[PDB]
Amino acid sequence: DQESCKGRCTEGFNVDKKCQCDELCSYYQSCCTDYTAECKPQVTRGDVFTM
């Protein structure tokens, strides 16, 4: 999204997995190899979205 219109932004990419890598979730915990499909808390991990 922020880097380029991808992930949550469908328009500027293809295969609409809304966690792709960056987006925002990268910083807000992680998306990139952390969340699977969408940019949303899936796993707690420990940091940021603490359980």
From Swiss-Prot:
Effect of residue 50 to A: Abolishes phosphorylation by CK2 and inhibits adhesion and spreading
The protein, known as: Somatomedin-B
Effect seen on changing residue 50 to E: Abolishes phosphorylation by CK2 and enhances adhesion and spreading
Phosphothreonine found at: 50
Motif Cell attachment site: chain residues: 45-47
Cystine crosslinks: 5-9, 5-21, 9-39, 19-21, 19-32, 25-31, 32-39
Taxonomic path: Eukaryota, Metazoa, Chordata, Craniata, Vertebrata
Domain SMB: 1-44
